[PDB]
Amino acid sequence: MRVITLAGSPRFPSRSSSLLEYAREKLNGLDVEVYHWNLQNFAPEDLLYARFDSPALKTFTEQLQQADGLIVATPVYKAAYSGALKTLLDLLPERALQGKVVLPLATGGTVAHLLAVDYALKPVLSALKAQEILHGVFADDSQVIDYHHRPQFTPNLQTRLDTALETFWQALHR
Amino acid sequence: MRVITLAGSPRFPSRSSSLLEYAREKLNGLDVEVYHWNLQNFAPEDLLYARFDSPALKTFTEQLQQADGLIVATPVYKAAYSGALKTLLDLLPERALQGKVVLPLATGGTVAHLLAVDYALKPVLSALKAQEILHGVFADDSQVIDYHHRPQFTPNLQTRLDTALETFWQALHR
Amino acid sequence: MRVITLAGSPRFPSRSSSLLEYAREKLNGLDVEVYHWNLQNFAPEDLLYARFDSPALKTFTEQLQQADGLIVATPVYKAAYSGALKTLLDLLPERALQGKVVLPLATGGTVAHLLAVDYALKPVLSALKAQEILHGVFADDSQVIDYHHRPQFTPNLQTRLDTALETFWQALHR
Amino acid sequence: MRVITLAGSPRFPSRSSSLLEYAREKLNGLDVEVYHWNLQNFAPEDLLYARFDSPALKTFTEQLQQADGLIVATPVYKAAYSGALKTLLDLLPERALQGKVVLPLATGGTVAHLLAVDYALKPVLSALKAQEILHGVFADDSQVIDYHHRPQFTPNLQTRLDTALETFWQALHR
Ligand SMILES: Cc1cc2nc3c(=O)[nH]c(=O)nc-3n(C[C@H](O)[C@H](O)[C@H](O)COP(=O)(O)O)c2cc1C
Ligand SMILES: Cc1cc2nc3c(=O)[nH]c(=O)nc-3n(C[C@H](O)[C@H](O)[C@H](O)COP(=O)(O)O)c2cc1C
Ligand SMILES: Cc1cc2nc3c(=O)[nH]c(=O)nc-3n(C[C@H](O)[C@H](O)[C@H](O)COP(=O)(O)O)c2cc1C
Ligand SMILES: Cc1cc2nc3c(=O)[nH]c(=O)nc-3n(C[C@H](O)[C@H](O)[C@H](O)COP(=O)(O)O)c2cc1C
Ligand SMILES: Cc1cc2nc3c(=O)[nH]c(=O)nc-3n(C[C@H](O)[C@H](O)[C@H](O)COP(=O)(O)O)c2cc1C
Ligand SMILES: Cc1cc2nc3c(=O)[nH]c(=O)nc-3n(C[C@H](O)[C@H](O)[C@H](O)COP(=O)(O)O)c2cc1C
């Protein structure tokens, strides 16, 4: 009944965030409570110098603890997740994702870096003890037609996202 | 209702196999179809020369097709899964694990190679399109009291196996 | 002064092998000891059942011992190196690549799996203690004009092979 | 003749930085010019919001371009490099490490995460086009006796660092 959507892009507007926006609306439609976070919710110095007393982190940690699921989105930066997202994940307590379903989403400039999700991001989410990690959705930039005014995807990206979200919603029932 | 267990060790008796035998004892007490396979059930020339016509391969793929879950165990060889296991995995169809929940297990000579499960094995299981990959269990060789005569594990390893199997069991029901 | 080239494809003729044949043509014009091996040079039962007494294994290990560099090529299977190649790699001694410079090459059905080289193959070569691992070359199947009758590559792939081999050549001299 | 040492830890004093300090002194002794950077050299907001016009980044980019080699150190955070270090690496231009020798160093709370170097950090350094990546040195925290007042390591850590640094220095000669 409660889901956190987390945007890992440092820019605004963000292509990977449009996937999260589409996800939010589907989940709202199914009467799931969705709480959206992004890196602007945190003081940069708190993130970079890994300062655990951050008030926003406290709120975020508390909200995560109460969430049944997490949807996390990232750009591919240098064949991995964004450093910006990792600075926040690094501040989460050990076992932060224990008992939780996790759906990872990424967008990349080249399809050449599709494996960044499986080989880089999933291992960090598992280190946080995610109970289940879903297959995820990678899309290269050309598959997101609009991320500035209204999330618009090619039909194949939209179908893969629909499939992922259905699987995630079914998972939230245990 | 149906589960495949797959041992990936080239040798026998095997530590990683004794892990699967323990899983089966726990599932045999729950009215389940458990189908067990090892690398011995296939011809070495079929596996090394990637022969798709292989008769055991056909049997295995059909059984896998109708199964709802997979538990697969490997030794850690050169900081990854065994080459032997991978020759079989390479022969499965592109989407062989689609819609199935997967539980990876491994044994390793040193705790220093614990991450072989998250960074090497899981991306291959994801390439096969696993719907959900569970956290899994790594056991280092210090934890296997006996694997020749029957599974005997130190208490820390048993609790972790027990926990993973509960999750696997619960995950199978949807 | 001495180099091992190692083909990791279970099949022949092979795309990834045609890459190694091109390397050898370039090194044959530089007064070099080049020693070439493939998975056919070993018995399938030895490799699948991890037999350390293997007679070809012994020959290979000695030759590898005195060699200054290694060029190894693999197809991409299930988002990683071939299982077939890995069965041989699993049989080498713990520090087999110590003090040697290594050049990894791969071929893949899609550019989407380019990262299999950095995330899957290189950590195994590092487990074998390679002194230096070079950047390497991934070639997708679109770039191999012919591999049956002789190596024929699109110009983009040839320039990249040429560059990697220059680095490998230069690296061998210390 | 010019080397950049880069500290990826967000804290001060840093255990992984003591390795870099030991490296600096060895290299100074061999009349190499060593330029040390850490994350405090950058405004946090420039790092987090990936702002390429950062004056410090300009200076850092220019110094890196002129360097023959790079030594980069990181703590293991969540089974990978630090996010803080990744935010800086993310701001480097494509091909930033082309033509350069790279020695990666890491310290981790548990030996269980030794593979974080091979499987997480090296692929990012390769994405930046490093010409050669050395084996590297991982050490769990217990091997660094002092990082507050004077870098002091166990004899085995000190020997592995000496070996790595010799290899790096030899490499700087091409
Ligand atoms: C600093 C930076 C580094 C990037 N590195 C990569 C890369 O290594 N591989 C890739 O496929 N795309 C790379 N890109 C492109 C982004 O992944 C891509 O444009 C993405 O959709 C941006 O998502 P966002 O708008 O949510 O930030 C990079 C972009 C930036 C700004
Ligand atoms: C494969 C690829 C890799 C990239 N790597 C970087 C990078 O490393 N650093 C950077 O500033 N931009 C990088 N870019 C550029 C960004 O993607 C840039 O923000 C984008 O091209 C501008 O278009 P956009 O705003 O619509 O995403 C990369 C782009 C691609 C396609
Ligand atoms: C060829 C070979 C290579 C191995 N390499 C590693 C290794 O890289 N890392 C590790 O932790 N253990 C390594 N080991 C130890 C095995 O992973 C360990 O003994 C494991 O329990 C074997 O399980 P099994 O009995 O099911 O074969 C290796 C063992 C063999 C036989
Ligand atoms: C069993 C098998 C599995 C494969 N899986 C992948 C894959 O996961 N990703 C990919 O890019 N290509 C995959 N391919 C395509 C091969 O990587 C590609 O055709 C390669 O060039 C084979 O090289 P070879 O001729 O040396 O065997 C696969 C091919 C086979 C035969
Ligand atoms: C936020 C945070 C996360 C950490 N996560 C891990 C971890 O996943 N694995 C590990 O082995 N150590 C972990 N550690 C311990 C550090 O890797 C270790 O103490 C390291 O030596 C610190 O290096 P530094 O002093 O250079 O920052 C973590 C430490 C912190 C502060
Ligand atoms: C394996 C391991 C994992 C750790 N993971 C975290 C973490 O995720 N978050 C955190 O704040 N601290 C983590 N720590 C604690 C830090 O390492 C902490 O800074 C340290 O225990 C304090 O001692 P030190 O300052 O001498 O390194 C971890 C420690 C270890 C040993």
Alpha-helical runs (H) found in C29-150 = 44-48, 55-66, 83-89, 116, 122-127
Torsion angle of the four alpha carbons A110, A111, A112, A116, in this order, in degrees rounded to the nearest 10: 100
In A, minimum Cα distance to C120 occurs at: A119
Ligand 6 centroid – CA D110 distance (Å): 9
Q: Does a cis peptide bond (omega within 30 degrees of 0) precede residue C10?
A: no
Ligand 1 centroid – CA A82 distance (Å): 8
Interacting residues of C81 by C-beta distance below 8 A, sequence separation 6+: C8, C74, C75, C106, C116, C120, C121, C124
In A, minimum Cα distance to B101 occurs at: A132
In C, minimum Cα distance to A78 occurs at: C115
Ligand 1 centroid – CA A108 distance (Å): 5
Cβ-count burial C31-50 (b if 16+ within 10 Å, e if not)? ebebbbbbbeebbbebbbbb
Q: Is B141 helix (H, G, I), strand (E, B) or coil?
A: helix
Ligand 4 centroid – CA B129 distance (Å): 16
Neighbours of B60 (CB within 10 A): 21
Could C78 and B124 be called an inter-chain contact, meaning their C-beta atoms sit closer than 8 Å?
yes
Distance CA C124, CA C117 (A): 10
Q: Is the CB of A145 under 6 A from ligand 1?
A: no
Q: Which of B87, B82, B84 lies closest to B105 in space, CA to CA?
A: B82
Which atom of ligand 4 lies nearest, measured to the CA of C76?
17
Q: Given its phi and psi angles, is residue D79 left (phi above 0), alpha (psi -120 to 50 degrees) or beta?
A: left
Bridge partners, A172 (sequence order): none
Q: Is the CB of A110 under 6 A from ligand 2?
A: yes
Q: Is the CB of D99 under 6 A from ligand 6?
A: no
Reading the block at residue B174, the tokens are: 């949807």
* Residue A28, min C-alpha distance to chain D (Å): 29
Which structural domain, as residue segments, surrounds residue B156?
1-174
State the chains in contact with A (3 or more Cβ–Cβ pairs under 8 Å).
B, C, D
What's the half-sphere exposure (Cβ side, CA atoms, 13 Å) at B56?
A: 15
Distance CA B43, CA A57 (A): 56
Give how far the C-alpha of residue A155 lies from the chain's centroid of Cα atoms, to the nearest Å: 21
Contact of A121 with A106, CB cutoff 8 Å: yes
* Residue A114, min C-alpha distance to chain B (Å): 11
Distance CA D84, CA D78 (A): 12
Distance CA B162, CA D22 (A): 46
Tell the residue nearest (CA) to atom 7 of ligand 2.
D94
Q: Which of B77, B88, A146, B79 lies closest to D122 in space, CA to CA?
A: B79
**Whats the size of chain D, residue-wise?**
174
Distance CA B37, CA B42 (A): 9
Bridge partners, D152 (sequence order): D146
Contact of C120 with C80, CB cutoff 8 Å: yes
Reading the block at residue C20, the tokens are: 């190694």
Which domain CATH number covers A36? 3.40.50.360
Neighbours of C5 (CB within 10 A): 24
Q: Which regions of chain B does DSSP assign to beta strands (E)?
A: 2-7, 33-37, 69-75, 101-108, 132-134, 137-140, 144-146, 152-153
For residue A79, the ligand closest to its alpha carbon is 1
The residue whose two tokens read 């280190």 is A127
Could A47 and D48 be called an inter-chain contact, meaning their C-beta atoms sit closer than 8 Å?
yes
**Whats the size of chain B, residue-wise?**
174
The tally of domains found in chain B comes to 1
Contact of C112 with C142, CB cutoff 8 Å: no
Distance CA A166, CA A21 (A): 15
Ligand 3 centroid – CA B108 distance (Å): 5
**Whats the size of chain C, residue-wise?**
174
Q: Amino acid identity of A164?
A: A
Which burial class, exposed, middle or buried, applies to D150 when counting CB atoms under 10 A from its CB (0-12, 13-18, 19+)?
A: exposed
Cβ-count burial A51-81 (b if 16+ within 10 Å, e if not)? eeebeebeebbeebeebbbbbbbbbbbbbbb
> What are φ and ψ of residue D154, in 5° steps?
-70, 160
Q: Which of A5, A9, A4, A3 lies closest to A147 in space, CA to CA?
A: A9
Which atom of ligand 6 lies nearest, measured to the CA of D112?
1
Q: Is the CB of D75 under 6 A from ligand 5?
A: yes
Q: H-helix or E-strand containing A93?
A: none
Q: Is the CB of C117 under 6 A from ligand 4?
A: no
> What are φ and ψ of residue B152, in 5° steps?
-140, 115
Reading the block at residue D40, the tokens are: 């405090």
Could A114 and C119 be called an inter-chain contact, meaning their C-beta atoms sit closer than 8 Å?
no
The one-character DSSP state at D93 is: P
Q: Which of B2, B4, B1 lies closest to B128 in space, CA to CA?
A: B4
| SS percent in chain D: helix, strand, coil, step 5 | 45, 25, 30
Q: Which regions of chain C does DSSP assign to beta strands (E)?
A: 2-7, 33-37, 69-75, 101-108, 132-134, 137-140, 144-146, 152-153
Q: What is the resolution of this structure in A?
A: 1.9
Q: Among B72, B77, B111, which residue has the most ligand 3 atoms within 8 Å of its CB, making it the best to mutate? A: B77
Bridge partners, D5 (sequence order): D36, D71
Which atom of ligand 3 lies nearest, measured to the CA of B10?
27
